[PDB]
């Protein structure tokens, strides 16, 4: 398309890549990212509707405690690029085809961002080596280099989708067999155990293991919701603290 | 005294703490964002190349992970600490490190639900409901509301962490933390157990892993009695078993009368059937069918006990506990570095194998 | 009833034929309350030293 | 209505007036009084139903230290007579009109029993004047005279409300607009909150507060009945006390 | 001489059950104590005697105490009167001395456990049993409360009578605080349980129903209708057309294959609910009951009301909020007739919530 | 220092100490069981028939009563003692007898409730619960768990005893075992309460012991509305209650149309009936019935309540609590060595009594 | 009734009677003894059902302090053999006409083992007589002979109850009144209480009574299985233990 439009799209994707990890101005969130990509490429309604229908999915997609997020940034950017590439915005092609492609590319962005943040350890090590010499310039520069690499992680894998055409990506994603799809599904249905594993490992004592087993035993009561179990944990902690501090006073 | 950083310097510190993330590592999480945020104050405090500088910069190269929004209080507190050290106030590095670690955890735990899971869902829902109409109002609304809330929180909490400074260190050292940490650990362990039980679905149904189905019984499952051609019969009072090896069962029509009065099973007048076969099912037959199903009585003629059913009858979430303990042992037995990523890929491969084998 | 490969804050993502599809099954307010409940329940988790 | 129901409800109101201050047999409590009027005046189940409905409100309605309670006695008796006069017990009309009428009657009984207890300051003076004569009969007679007087303090309003014809009261109850009746039915589940909050406010400490939330969290388990829940609370109490004392 | 039997003890029992009734505002619960004590004095001195007059003037003073916990005082007074009636040199004010200095602690103990702990629990249990209109509940309340009262009074009257003036030493301090704390814990725990269980303002309403999504094409209970009646089941895929739709196999419920058309409106077969089914008799009914037993929504479009989502958060959320608000306004208002005002205001809140359609 | 036993010898000693019981005697408790447990050490120490072997064997004709499971520590310490006695050490002959005599008392006192009365109830209850479903998993499960626990305990404490010697007296000492006794007793009481609640079923349905059945209501039970000749309608809005006392109700078929508009109940257009007499249920009526039953609405037009229902409404297992407390008092006061048997037969007679009388 | 079946039940009952004294693998417990006997002799589902039913009755049947237990071994074995001899497994007569028979044969086994152990003093006298010459072979042989006698105690009656004609036993077991059968069944559905009573009598203190009621009121939660309740009891006991220890130290 227009050269200015292409430059705008690439810069906007770079900002979205930056804020998929910065997560401060919410530049990467679909509601603004898809709408703003639509702003660059003419038609406003396509981007607005894609962002609106993707923000519903993107709720609660915040990475917490190193539990990496589904990376809505690349999902939004790539879905918007595919939508503008294919001249169809009947609000049915948007939901039927573009949204599942966005989810799959969100998983792809998940693996991409995990790879790049694993690579970030090298640059942070170089930053430590530079800060050994005690220069603000070196550490600031290495931090900026890591940030710009993370931004390029979406800047570069956007022109590829914008360039090749519009039908190879959708067909390629649709050609994935049930083999790997269901395998990854059952893998993700148990991956959270590892995430909780380090949390349990860090805080653990013979005094605290009983509470873990107590929670595990009491959990199957479906009548108590998660917030109910949280309040129950809080009150159990309060009671134990009161009973211990009663002897602490004496 | 001197080295009193002005309001402009604090605003620059906040505009740089804008970038707390970005140097996100797996081994030293979010560590460089702190240094980037405090660079202006440190630069105003010491010149580059100074040994005291050297030590100050090297101090902040440790683990620091929390919610980025609730870090301005911590930033202000450590800024106050740094300006205390600059003037020569006797406070060791251990004090600052303990101050940081004190609310690195609990503040993250309280900020994660209040921002990622409380404010953002509401703002995103309103933005999406506005955007469903194809109007440019929604993205600007989301942007303005979220950035205003975030900027107000950042600035005001940063200032509240600047003022009331060493007082918060006294509060930390007053023994309260020895209670906050214990309470948080107890609550976290309890909730972790609950989540291990609940948020780990290792459903083992599959097309394989199905234990052999047994013929069950002659009434433990839904269905009625079919006598020769048509009609539905109910078992009556037992009158005794004959010597040949068959017991005559009283037969009653679905009206309260008595007909037939014979034996049950193939050779008898009526035999047991499920709901699949009989047609013209009448209202009384429905009444008894829902009476049976509402009682918890079995449904399939051949009940199938999956491996998941056996595991649940043992204890729900058995496999989840076993996997948790296995990964705990793997993390305890030092299998070099990068162990979590290897565990993740191995478990994904294991899931693929389980699905293709027909187990899960 | 079919397999839920990925479940977003609303709806899920199954396979269906050869073309992937997404179905939304939650009203936005209900989805917001659901993510609120999940976040507050998991808020009990963590709260620890985190190294 | 046969006269047997009439004199049965009369005597039941009499004992209700007795325990309005006696508070020993609890014939004045709604679960007892409304049920009793249920057996006496024909329809019996509705008496139990609204007795249970109003008992929640009746908790926290005890008088301590000259602070006269809202007098659940007159409220219960008058509400029971109203239901047995008004042939509608659909558990919506039960909780719609009869409960707020009972609350207003409770305030009226509060002021009336305050007047009666004020009047008792005279009869006690005659009692001690007779005691100055050293006669046991005189003081006993004065005591049961006071008891009889407060028995009438609830017997007479019961007779008065029974005096009116059924058509007038049923038309007055039928003149209530539908929307307000259903709104009050909705709010019937609200008026118990203040009564519970009274007891909650009477005893509360930062040491004891967690138990309220623990009970609130564990209550949704529908398989544990009220008596089982009470046993659970008791055993929690002895466990806490045993662990606290040994320090 | 002048030793009292057990029959007179039962008489002073039954005359102490009328401790209230002669209640005033400056000298409360005065004549009830005399009504209790009289038979012992009748056995001791004849009516009209100067000693009887002095004893009548003895118990004429101020005596306020929780009624249920009064048997220890009645027994102590009985023992002291028996001792004074056989020429012992105790001071005449010793009875007033022991009474005046002890009603405080006994009342302070008696009020919470009896009025605020035992009665609320028993009444709530009775009402929970009575919610079905069953005669079991009033009988249970009557029997258990009367039995508790009778046993307590009988045990305590001899606890005071047999011991004498040592009851003050027996009670003392600290030991009663344990019972106070236990009663408070139990009462407020049960109060929380009742808050959760017996505050129902369900928000179903005509309004407060969130918009319903058409949902899906097989995720709810139903069967595949095929044009001119009959019921079919989806089979395999015969190849997706270039338009974007795929042709499947419409297997009859007999093992055969027929139709071979696309699904949805113009296709041979499409999903439909149980509402529009005809001649539903057969294995179709078994399939339907299996589907609903699988945990499948009956309606084609799922509808959620505010009560359901509130329960999804945590049951009794509005009850907790209302209780906290009422507690705060009770602590702040600091009035005399505030409870009635709060009650009528809550009635107005209920009627406005219902008129708006929320509940 | 020669005469040192090997690991296989230790395993053989444990396997034969497994056979400790067998010579049950009222005059010398398990006298030669200990001898059989210690046989091979003396077999490889000295040939039978010599004075040393004769004395070493003869040293075990004393009273020896202890819990059979906790006997590996004694075996290990005695093997250790005899090793030094056989290695030219001046250890006193009667020291082994004295330490054994001291060990029998407290060790048996603590192992008696822990094994027979604490863990055995757990394993037996779990096995019975698994077997109630008619599954083969229960007996094999019981075997494997019990054998694993017993083998692990036996082998590990035998190794500990041999490696430690007489120092296990200081290892246990006093006070330590009190904690295990208290914890085991607490666990036993809790699980006994659970078992008493769960596995004592005296369901009081019977022909008698049924309270009178209430007529329920006019729509509080699962059913539909019938207007004379077929068809099913639904109650509508109120047009105004008549002065007689009945209210006119709108009747709507499964089309939205309003016909009849009569008074509900018998004499009017349509009346509420159960599904027993319904004919040709096909249509949306089945959907309505499914919705009603999914709403928890009862099916029987009359609510029949039994005595077991009343007790359940009070609390499940109430009569079980009464029975167990009465029985506890009975053996607390009767004080007869045979008393449990007599209780069993008498309450069997009582069980016959309720069945004939119609309560049970 | 194949000859392999006779030899299987003979050796199996011999092992069960052995376990009445040694009691390590617990072959004599009804849950395993009856289940394995049913495994040997054709039908097993009714066998495992009856074993599970009798296991709870076997609760609290451990011999302590030279006081011999009701000896559930002979009860279980003879009841299982009598059941398999009767072609009637409607789950009613198993709790109706077998459990009371199990109790009666338990008393019979008690009176048998009392005499057997009383006469074992003679074989122990012979054992020390053979020990007076100084050989382990003799005492080992006498130990084996004593165990052989103990096993035969159960082995012979198991054979005599099997060699009887099946027609006589099936006529006898069907000659009982139906009402007495149902009465014995409903009574045996309650006898298990007695089994726990002595246990509660053995361990009971003011400190420990509240736990019994806590478990009694928490048990109605069907969503918690018996193993879950075991873990719950363990954690509760552990928590109380640490609280009391830190209160004593505090
Ligand atoms: O809570 C820990 C914290 O870790 C990282 O900084 C980010 O993933 C945050 O979203 C998260 O809250
Ligand atoms: O202790 C207060 C107690 O004494 C008061 O005089 C009476 O109103 C009693 O009803 C009350 O319970
Ligand atoms: O501890 C003594 C010991 O004596 C016998 O061997 C058996 O009754 C055991 O159950 C008991 O434990």
Task: Confirm if B43 and B78 have CB atoms less than 8 A apart.
Answer: no
Which of E139, E221, E223, E298 is most worth mutating to test chain F (most F CB atoms within 10 A of its CB)?
Answer: E298
Determine the Cα angle at G95 with ends G90 and G99, to 5°. Answer: 135
- Listed in order, strand segments (DSSP E) in chain B are 224-227, 232-241, 247-253, 262-263, 270-273
Task: Confirm if B130 and A49 have CB atoms less than 8 A apart.
Answer: no
Q: Can you tell me whether residue A208 is helix, strand or coil?
A: coil
Whether residue B312 sits in one domain with residue B178:
no
- Ligand 2 atom nearest residue E65's Cα: 4
Whether residue E272 sits in one domain with residue E190:
no
Minimum CA–CA partner of G217 in chain D? D228
Q: What is the spatial distance between Cα A17 and Cα E359, in angstroms, rounded to a whole number?
A: 47
Q: What is the spatial distance between Cα B46 and Cα A134, in angstroms, rounded to a whole number?
A: 11
B319 CB-contact burial (10 Å; exposed 0-12 / middle 13-18 / buried 19+): buried
Residue F2 lies in a domain: no
Task: Confirm if B203 and B133 have CB atoms less than 8 A apart.
Answer: no
Residue F216 lies in a domain: no
Phi-psi label, residue E199: left if phi above 0, alpha if psi -120 to 50, beta otherwise: beta
Which pair of structure tokens corresponds to residue D18?
């007795």
User: Around Cβ B220, how many Cβ atoms within 10 Å?
Assistant: 12
- Specify the pairing of strand E257-258 against strand C12-14: unpaired
What are C12's strand-pairing partners?
C23
Which has the closest alpha carbon to G234: F317, A244, F68, A216?
Answer: A216
Please tell me if residue G147 touches chain F, with a CB cutoff of 8 Å.
yes
Query: Which residues in chain B are contacts of A123 at CB distance < 8 A?
Result: 23
Ligand 3 centroid distance, CA of E119 (Å): 51
Please tell me if residue B279 touches chain F, with a CB cutoff of 8 Å.
no
Resolution to 1 decimal place, in Å: 3.8
Residue B234 lies in a domain: yes
Question: Tokens 């029959």 correspond to what residue?
Answer: E7
Task: Confirm if A58 and A72 have CB atoms less than 8 A apart.
Answer: yes
Query: Which residues in chain F are contacts of E280 at CB distance < 8 A?
Result: 281-283, 286
Residue E125 to residues D34, D52, E142, Cα–Cα distance (Å)? 16, 9, 12
Distance from CA of C45 to the nearest CA of E (A): 17
Whether residue E277 sits in one domain with residue E317:
no
What are F225's strand-pairing partners?
F272
Q: What is the spatial distance between Cα B26 and Cα G88, in angstroms, rounded to a whole number?
A: 68
Q: How many residues does chain G have?
A: 250
What are F232's strand-pairing partners?
F226
At a CB cut-off of 8 Å and minimum separation 6, what does E106 contact?
E65, E66, E69, E72, E73, E171
Ligand 3 centroid distance, CA of F27 (Å): 14
F119 CB-contact burial (10 Å; exposed 0-12 / middle 13-18 / buried 19+): buried
Determine the Cα angle at F221 with ends F218 and F225, to 5°. Answer: 55
Task: Confirm if D191 and D55 have CB atoms less than 8 A apart.
Answer: no
What are B214's strand-pairing partners?
B303
At a CB cut-off of 8 Å and minimum separation 6, what does G132 contact?
F58
Experimental method: cryo-EM
Whether residue E172 sits in one domain with residue E46:
yes
For residue G86, report the phi and psi dihedrals to the nearest 5 degrees: -110, 115
Q: What is the spatial distance between Cα D136 and Cα E34, in angstroms, rounded to a whole number?
A: 9
Whether residue F173 sits in one domain with residue F60:
yes
Which pair of structure tokens corresponds to residue B214?
């047994």
Which pair of structure tokens corresponds to residue B45?
């405090």
Q: What is the spatial distance between Cα D38 and Cα D83, in angstroms, rounded to a whole number?
A: 9
Q: What is the spatial distance between Cα D161 and Cα B139, in angstroms, rounded to a whole number?
A: 67
- Ligand 3 atom nearest residue F65's Cα: 2
Residue B198 lies in a domain: no
For residue E288, report the phi and psi dihedrals to the nearest 5 degrees: -65, -45
Task: Confirm if A55 and A31 have CB atoms less than 8 A apart.
Answer: yes
Please tell me if residue C24 touches chain E, with a CB cutoff of 8 Å.
yes
Whether residue B183 sits in one domain with residue B41:
yes
Q: What is the spatial distance between Cα B33 and Cα G84, in angstroms, rounded to a whole number?
A: 78
Which has the closest alpha carbon to A51: B129, C21, C36?
Answer: B129
Q: Is the CB of D68 within 6 Å of ligand 2?
A: no
What are E252's strand-pairing partners?
E232
Residue E301 lies in a domain: no
Whether residue F247 sits in one domain with residue F194:
no
Task: Confirm if B95 and B133 have CB atoms less than 8 A apart.
Answer: no
- Nearest ligand to residue F112 Cα: 3
Which pair of structure tokens corresponds to residue F153?
């305990």
Task: Count structural domains, chain F.
Answer: 3
Q: What is the spatial distance between Cα B68 and Cα A64, in angstroms, rounded to a whole number?
A: 11
Distance from CA of E281 to the nearest CA of B (A): 6
Whether residue B229 sits in one domain with residue B182:
no
Residue A57 to residues A49, A187, C11, E310, Cα–Cα distance (Å)? 13, 21, 8, 21
Whether residue B152 sits in one domain with residue B63:
yes
Residue B277 lies in a domain: yes
Whether residue B159 sits in one domain with residue B63:
yes
Is the pair F, E in contact (3+ CB pairs within 8 Å)? Answer: yes
Q: What is the spatial distance between Cα B318 and Cα B326, in angstroms, rounded to a whole number?
A: 12
The helix, strand and coil proportions of chain F, stated in percent and rounded to the nearest 5, come to 55, 10, 40
Which has the closest alpha carbon to F111: G110, G65, G58, G117?
Answer: G65
Residue F214 lies in a domain: no
Ligand 2 centroid distance, CA of E163 (Å): 25
Task: Confirm if A107 and C6 have CB atoms less than 8 A apart.
Answer: yes
Whether residue F146 sits in one domain with residue F58:
yes
Report the run of H or E that residue E235 belongs to, with start and end.
Answer: strand E231-240
Domain that holds residue B244: 224-294
For residue F129, report the phi and psi dihedrals to the nearest 5 degrees: -60, -40
Please provide the distance, in angstroms rounded to a whole number, between the alpha carbons at the two ends of chain A.
79
Please tell me if residue A227 touches chain D, with a CB cutoff of 8 Å.
no
State the number of CA atoms in the 13 A half-sphere of D120 facing the CB.
30
Which has the closest alpha carbon to D140: A226, E36, F293, B189?
Answer: E36
Task: Confirm if E259 and E278 have CB atoms less than 8 A apart.
Answer: no
Residue E218 lies in a domain: no
Which pair of structure tokens corresponds to residue F108?
């048996």
Q: What is the spatial distance between Cα B9 and Cα B7, in angstroms, rounded to a whole number?
A: 5
Q: What is the spatial distance between Cα F187 and Cα F183, in angstroms, rounded to a whole number?
A: 6
Which has the closest alpha carbon to F19: D14, G18, E129, B233?
Answer: G18
- Nearest ligand to residue E21 Cα: 2
Q: Which residues line ligand 3 (CB under 6 A)?
A: F 65-68, 108, 112, 116; G 62-64
Shortest CB distance from A60 goes to which of C3, C39, C43? Answer: C39
Query: Which residues in chain E are contacts of D199 at CB distance < 8 A?
Result: 116, 120, 187-188, 191
Q: After which residues is chain D broken (C to N over 2.5 A)?
A: none
Q: What is the spatial distance between Cα E313 and Cα E304, in angstroms, rounded to a whole number?
A: 13
B86 CB-contact burial (10 Å; exposed 0-12 / middle 13-18 / buried 19+): buried
Whether residue E142 sits in one domain with residue E173:
yes
Q: Is the CB of B108 within 6 Å of ligand 1?
A: yes
Distance from CA of B284 to the nearest CA of F (A): 4
Longest dimension (CA), chain E: 121
Which has the closest alpha carbon to E223: F223, B287, F286?
Answer: F286
Task: Confirm if B232 and B285 have CB atoms less than 8 A apart.
Answer: yes
Report the run of H or E that residue F251 belongs to, with start and end.
Answer: strand F247-252
What angle separates helix G226-249 from helix G209-218, to the nearest 10 degrees?
150
Q: What is the spatial distance between Cα E114 and Cα E68, in angstroms, rounded to a whole number?
A: 8
What are B263's strand-pairing partners?
B248
Q: What is the spatial distance between Cα F96 and Cα F78, in angstroms, rounded to a whole number?
A: 7
């Amino acid at each position: 398309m227009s050269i200015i439009s292409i430059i705008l799209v690439l810069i906007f994707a770079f900002l979205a890549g930056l804020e998929g990890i910065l997560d401060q101005w919410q530049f990467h969130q679909p509601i603004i990212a898809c709408s703003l990509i639509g702003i660059a490429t003419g038609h406003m309604a396509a981007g607005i509707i894609l962002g609106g229908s993707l923000q519903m999915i993107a709720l609660g997609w915040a990475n917490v405690g190193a539990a990496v997020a589904p990376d809505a940034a690349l999902a939004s950017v790539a879905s918007a690029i595919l939508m503008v590439q294919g001249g169809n915005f009947d609000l049915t092609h948007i939901t039927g085809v573009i949204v599942p492609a966005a989810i799959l590319l969100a998983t792809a962005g998940l693996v991409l961002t995990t790879l790049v943040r694993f690579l970030s350890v090298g640059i942070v090590h170089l930053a430590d080596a530079a800060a050994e010499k005690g220069s603000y310039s070196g550490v600031a520069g290495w931090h900026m280099f890591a940030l710009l690499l993370q931004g390029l992680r979406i800047a570069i894998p956007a022109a590829i989708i914008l360039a090749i055409p519009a039908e190879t990506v959708t067909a390629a994603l649709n050609a994935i067999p049930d083999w790997v799809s269901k395998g990854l599904a059952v893998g993700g249905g148990m991956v959270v155990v590892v995430g909780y594993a380090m949390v349990i490992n860090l805080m653990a004592t013979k005094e605290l293991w009983p509470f873990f087993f107590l929670g595990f035993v009491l959990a199957p009561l479906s009548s108590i919701t998660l917030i109910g179990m949280g309040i129950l944990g809080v009150v159990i902690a309060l009671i134990y603290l009161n009973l211990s501090n009663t002897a602490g006073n004496g | 005294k001197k080295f009193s950083l002005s309001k402009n310097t604090r605003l620059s510190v906040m505009f740089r703490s804008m970038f707390l993330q970005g140097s996100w590592n797996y081994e030293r999480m979010q560590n460089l964002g702190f240094l980037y945020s405090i660079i202006p104050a440190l630069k105003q405090f010491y010149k580059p190349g100074s040994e005291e500088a050297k030590e100050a910069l090297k101090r902040h190269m440790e683990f620091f992970n929390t919610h980025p929004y609730v870090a301005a209080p911590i930033v202000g507190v450590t800024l106050a600490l740094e300006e205390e050290i600059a003037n020569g106030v006797e406070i060791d590095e251990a004090a600052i490190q303990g101050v940081k670690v004190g609310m690195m955890g609990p503040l993250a735990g309280i900020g994660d639900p209040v921002f990622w899971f409380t404010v953002r869902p509401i703002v995103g829902a309103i933005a999406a409901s506005l955007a469903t109409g194809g109007s440019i109002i929604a993205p600007i609304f989301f942007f303005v509301v979220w950035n205003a809330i975030r900027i107000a929180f950042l600035w005001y909490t940063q200032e509240f962490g600047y003022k009331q400074g060493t007082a918060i260190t006294s509060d930390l050292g007053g023994g309260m933390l020895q209670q906050i940490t214990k309470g948080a650990s107890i609550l976290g362990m309890f909730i972790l157990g609950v989540l291990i039980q609940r948020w780990v679905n290792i459903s083992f149904t599959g097309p394989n892993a199905m234990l052999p189905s047994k013929p069950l019984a002659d009434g433990a499952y839904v269905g009625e009695w079919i006598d020769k051609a048509g009609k539905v019969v109910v078992q009556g009072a037992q009158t005794g078993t004959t010597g040949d090896g068959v017991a005559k069962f009283d037969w009653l029509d679905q009206a309260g009368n008595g007909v037939g009065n014979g034996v049950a099973g193939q050779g008898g007048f009526a035999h047991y059937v499920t709901v699949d076969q009989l047609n013209t099912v009448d209202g009384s037959t429905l009444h008894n069918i829902l009476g049976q199903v509402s009682s918890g009585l079995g449904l399939s003629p051949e009940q199938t006990q999956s491996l998941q059913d056996v595991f649940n009858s043992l204890i729900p979430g058995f496999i989840a506990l076993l996997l948790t303990f296995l990964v705990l042992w793997i993390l305890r037995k030092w299998k070099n570095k990068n162990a979590p990523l290897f565990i993740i890929i191995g478990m994904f491969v294991l899931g693929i194998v389980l699905h293709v084998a027909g187990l899960a | 009833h079919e397999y839920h490969l990925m479940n977003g804050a609303n709806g899920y993502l199954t396979r269906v034929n050869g073309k992937y599809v997404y179905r939304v099954t939650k009203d936005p307010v209900s989805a917001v309350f659901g993510v609120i409940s999940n976040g507050w329940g998991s808020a009990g988790a963590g709260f620890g030293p985190q190294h």
